[PDB]
Nucleic acid binder design. Structure first.
Ligand SMILES: Nc1ccn([C@@H]2O[C@H](COP(=O)(O)OP(=O)(O)OP(=O)(O)O)[C@@H](O)[C@H]2O)c(=O)n1
Ligand SMILES: [Ca+2]
Ligand SMILES: [K+]
Length: 430
DNA sequence: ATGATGACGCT
DNA sequence: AGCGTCAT
């Protein structure tokens, strides 16, 4: 009862750019705006692989990982933009730079955790407290939340989407206790007003639209963000959790989309997150380990403590390329040449990073996949990264991997390589 | 023949 | 260290 923590101590948001690479290419090329369009990498094999899809193209069934030639079967008018290719590999620099535009706007409002090229978590607790003092108890207008959905409302005793949105928002605001400055529901609402402001600024200053979730922790914020996409934000209160989780497949919760989530389902014989509440913490720890069991016990009640880490820059900087099918690398010369190509792009990004961010990497990790290995990495070895020089870095990578060559011939490479990966890690300030 | 990254857990 | 998991 009175001692039972409810995980309502923080306001956390997750911001996710809608069809990010598509928005970048549509900003650059107005002919792509408001059209079914997709972003593709490479082109010779089956038209290239689709990596991002506009909402207009998704209505036709186009998805990520589709070959562009197949996507054109679903959507003959599909417009395509191609990822830059440099040194024979995809080069994502345009999207990384657009991402920096967005993250630097977000950092004005609060400290952010870069979660991916196009997602950041925001810890808003402190900004909320401040804005609450600026309010002095005045009600929060629905005009301050023009794109906000309150998950689970409307409820109780119109047939259009926006009318539903406004109805739920009104019920929520009508029930708010704007007098109590430590009300969790009030704090989430203020958090949502701030996130509206953040999203307005991102759109004004970059042209890019995003969705967001606002809740009390990262898992609920991420789940919230996915509930109303694109160009909308969703508030998931602590009170909404029982109904939301009662039909929510377990695999939808961040970190449960893989083998652990499958084993939760199979060992416990359940399907939905809320069903987890019927097990004791010790039962869950017995099945899934002490850490996982504690996490699941708290999470299925809507409680999570993973902090928004203050980290706006990636921790490692890497370059990778796959060599599928008949293109697998089968000679010494081939392996060396592609290691040089990867290392040249890596040198370029590292030099940029050292100038921009005042740091230097100190370890080089070299990862390969061999033909027939189902695993995504067959081997990983490290060496010292002492100078930002592509020829040295590629020579060192070759050195640390060369005894993997089975061939008795000095010039051949067996088994052939289906993946090369260079990653610079262990950054020190400079 | 999805392909390009990136973080973190386990041992 | 080196591998496995999960994600965007
Ligand atoms: N299997 C995946 C999924 C995502 N990404 C990377 O993560 C970025 C954002 O992924 P995601 O948010 O899932 O896709 P969006 O295009 O942004 O679509 P949405 O509107 O649903 O956010 C992609 O552009 C891509 O760079 C990737 O490389 N491989
Ligand atoms: Ca996105
Ligand atoms: K994303």
């Amino acid at each position: 009862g009175p001692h039972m923590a409810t995980g309502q101590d923080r306001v956390v948001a997750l911001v996710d750019m809608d069809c990010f690479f598509v928005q970048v290419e549509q900003r650059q090329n107005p002919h792509l705006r408001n059209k079914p369009c997709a972003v593709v990498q490479y082109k010779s094999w089956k038209g290239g692989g689709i990596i991002a899809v506009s909402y207009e193209a998704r209505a036709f069934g186009v998805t990520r990982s589709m070959w562009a030639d197949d996507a054109k079967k679903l959507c003959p008018d599909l417009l395509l933009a191609q990822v830059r290719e440099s040194r024979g590999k995809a080069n994502l620099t345009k999207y990384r730079e657009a991402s920096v535009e967005v993250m630097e706007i977000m950092s004005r409002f609060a400290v952010i955790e870069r979660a991916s090229i196009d997602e950041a978590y925001v810890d808003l607790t402190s900004a909320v407290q401040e804005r609450l003092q600026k309010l002095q108890g005045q009600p929060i207008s629905a005009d301050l939340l023009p794109s906000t959905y309150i998950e689970g409302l409307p409820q109780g005793p119109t047939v259009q989407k926006e009318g539903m949105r406004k109805q739920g928002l009104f019920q929520w605001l009508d029930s708010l206790q704007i007098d109590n400055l430590t009300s969790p529901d009030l704090q989430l609402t203020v958090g949502a007003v701030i996130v509206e402001e953040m999203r307005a600024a991102i759109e004004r200053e970059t042209g890019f639209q995003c969705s967001a979730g606002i809740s009390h922790n990262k898992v609920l914020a991420k789940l919230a963000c996915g509930l109303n996409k694109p160009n909308r934000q969703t508030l998931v209160s602590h009170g909404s959790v029982p109904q939301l989780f009662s039909q929510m497949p377990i695999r939808k919760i961040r970190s449960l989309g893989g083998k652990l989530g499958a084993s939760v389902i199979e060992i416990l014989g359940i399907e939905y997150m809320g069903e987890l509440t019927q097990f004791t913490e010790s039962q869950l720890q017995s099945h899934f380990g002490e850490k996982n069991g504690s996490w699941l016990y708290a999470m299925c009640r809507g409680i999570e403590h993973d902090p928004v880490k203050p980290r706006q820059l990636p921790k490692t900087i890497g370059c990778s390329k796959n060599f599928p099918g008949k293109t697998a690398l089968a000679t010494r010369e081939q392996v060396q040449w592609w290691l040089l190509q990867l290392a040249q792009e890596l040198e370029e990004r590292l030099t940029k990073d050292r100038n921009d961010n005042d740091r230097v990497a100190t370890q080089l990790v070299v990862s390969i996949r061999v033909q027939g290995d189902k695993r995504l990495s067959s081997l990983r070895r490290c060496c010292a990264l002492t100078r930002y020089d592509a020829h040295k870095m590629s020579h060192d990578a070759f050195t640390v991997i060369k005894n993997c060559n089975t061939s008795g011939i000095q010039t051949e490479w067996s088994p052939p390589l289906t993946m090369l990966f260079l990653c610079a890690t262990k950054f020190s300030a400079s």
